[PDB]
Design a protein around this ligand. Structure first.
Ligand code: JYM
Lengths: 297, 255
């Protein structure tokens, strides 16, 4: 439907994983959009797998908490993905809120919306695999949406072994760090748990500088897992018996400002055993959300 | 797990929207079902050679059937369509897809042509690549056997794969139904057992509803060693698939 002559660049938003994102406006309708420009390797690997997956998956996923793909404009050289325009990502918003903090009801609203978006993905056999604040977009009406599905994939039932090189380090689940042969929807929940904590404490929960540092940061907080808490841990490929054995921290310390319900939810989202980790579906029913509202940011 | 029912349901919706047109080869002036069989049998070889997932194979076939449903193709260009389809399915599905040069090597087209076809295939399919396959249904059906059985799985996969070869008749069946037939046919061949009750609840398919596809599939199975195309039988001799293509097909089903 589209053609690039009708769009006027307003400003470049930046360069993520792939492509470049701009703010643009439709000259004819006045619609403000976000354009993701993707270079095709016309010589000579062609259309990138990331673009193929992002496009194919986002065209299936219609949901108010998933960024809406409006058009794909082809040329021989370039692909432009036309998306609805959202003015802010959650990373930039957490910075802007560093002094005063994000109000607990907005935190609750945002987490609620992220879980609805994620349950929709999971219901439609899609794993996101890069949930992090920079990939979560907010508008002025109090909405937040999942975005950048460049790292996503359509999964099967049951899953088979997928790409190991996965999720930004700080938001990466233990099962991935430990080199598990199978991972699934639980990885996304782990990421969201990290994000929930980060909204509360105003700092990344597990800011690791390396894989081993990331694990150890997780262990120091949640306790080093054993076969009791996580049947199977010690048979995982990158598990080592030399792992120091830290005690689990009282959750009133992990996330001080949180109520009993909040702590209950967070600890379910961060359960070590992916099988017992709460589903997005189940988390929506958690008592934490009983009084959920929709504040404007 | 959890989402299993939601996913099943949603794939049942999507297999109707990703279904090619059953009549399409009659509208193709220069290609035939026999040419298509050859193409698909070559893709089987390619999957082996590069050790590609079976899912990748099934996806590529879907892409090809949908592309040919809308676009007239001369016979000299059919393999170009097929190579581009396999490339795309690899990009979608594989952890390590082969590089474009590897897809040039296996064909003779130029690299530029393959790469240009890739883009045309994407346009014709409007980037709708997340198509449900026979394989994705089988995989869920496999969670129901009591107990799990190796040969049942590999034989089912083999029979689903044979279905890819023959547009007439298998284009007229949905992936979920072919998977059902293949699963039951495999189960009965190996263990004497039948389409489980739990799968009737899940799918709302019964042995009766599966009969037409099953009658066709059983025939395909019996006639397999005399099929012009043999790469799937070869592939399924390997221990990787427990030699299942060597097994003798049953002669009746007493349904
Ligand atoms: N405000 C905002 N931010 C986005 O992404 C944030 C990152 C920040 C780093 C530069 C790449 C984009 C966006 N990405 C999109 C798009 F994916 F295009 F939808 N829209 C966006 N709107």
């Amino acid at each position: 439907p589209g053609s690039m002559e009708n769009f006027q660049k307003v400003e470049k938003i930046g360069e993520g994983t792939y492509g470049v994102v701009y703010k643009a406006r439709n000259k004819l309708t006045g619609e403000v959009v976000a354009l993701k420009k993707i270079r095709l390797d016309t010589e000579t690997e062609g259309v990138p797998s990331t673009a193929i997956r992002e496009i194919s998956l986002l065209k299936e996923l219609n949901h108010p908490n998933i960024v809406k793909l409006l058009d794909v404009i082809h040329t021989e050289n370039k692909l432009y993905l036309v998306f609805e325009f959202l003015h802010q990502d959650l990373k930039k918003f957490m910075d802007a809120s560093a002094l005063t903090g994000i109000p607990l009801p907005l935190i609750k609203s945002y987490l609620f919306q992220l879980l609805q978006g994620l349950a929709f993905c999971h219901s439609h056999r899609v794993l996101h695999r890069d949930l992090k604040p920079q990939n979560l977009l907010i508008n002025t009406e109090g909405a937040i949406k999942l975005a950048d599905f460049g790292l996503a994939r359509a999964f099967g039932v049951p899953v088979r072994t997928y790409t190991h090189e996965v999720v930004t380090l700080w938001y990466r689940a233990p099962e991935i760090l430990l080199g598990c042969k199978y991972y699934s929807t639980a990885v996304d929940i782990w990421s969201l748990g990290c994000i929930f904590a980060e909204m509360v404490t105003r700092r990344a929960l597990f800011p690791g500088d390396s894989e081993i540092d990331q694990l150890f940061r997780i262990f120091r907080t949640l306790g080093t897992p054993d076969e009791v808490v996580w049947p199977g841990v010690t048979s995982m490929p990158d598990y080592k018996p030399s792992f120091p054995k830290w005690a689990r921290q009282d959750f009133s310390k992990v996330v001080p400002p949180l109520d009993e319900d909040g702590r209950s939810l967070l600890s379910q989202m961060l359960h070590y055993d992916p099988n017992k980790r709460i589903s997005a579906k189940a988390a929506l029913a958690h008592p934490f959300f009983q009084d959920v509202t929709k504040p404007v940011p | 797990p959890d989402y299993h029912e939601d996913i099943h349901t949603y794939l049942r919706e999507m297999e109707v929207k990703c279904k090619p047109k059953v009549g399409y080869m009659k509208k193709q002036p220069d290609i035939t079902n026999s040419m298509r069989a050859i193409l698909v049998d070559w893709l089987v070889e390619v999957g082996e050679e590069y050790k590609l997932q079976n899912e990748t194979l099934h996806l590529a076939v879907n892409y090809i059937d949908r592309f040919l449903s809308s676009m007239s193709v001369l016979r000299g260009k059919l393999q170009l369509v097929g190579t581009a389809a396999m490339l795309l399915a690899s990009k979608f599905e594989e952890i390590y897809p082969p590089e474009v040069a590897e897809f040039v090597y296996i064909t003779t087209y130029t690299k530029k042509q393959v790469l240009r076809m890739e883009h045309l295939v994407l346009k014709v399919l409007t980037f709708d690549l997340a198509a449900p396959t026979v394989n994705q249904f089988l995989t869920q059906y496999f969670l129901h056997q009591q107990p799990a059985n190796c040969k049942v799985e590999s034989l089912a996969m083999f029979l689903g794969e044979l279905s890819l070869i023959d547009a007439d008749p298998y284009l007229k069946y949905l992936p979920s139904v072919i998977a059902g037939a293949a699963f039951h046919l495999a189960l009965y061949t190996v263990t004497g057992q039948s389409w489980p009750e739990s799968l009737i609840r899940k799918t709302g398919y019964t042995l009766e509803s599966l009969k037409p596809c099953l009658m066709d599939l059983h025939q395909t199975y019996l006639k397999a060693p005399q099929h012009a195309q043999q790469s799937i039988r070869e592939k399924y001799k390997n221990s990787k698939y427990h030699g299942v293509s060597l097994l003798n097909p049953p002669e009746t089903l007493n349904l």
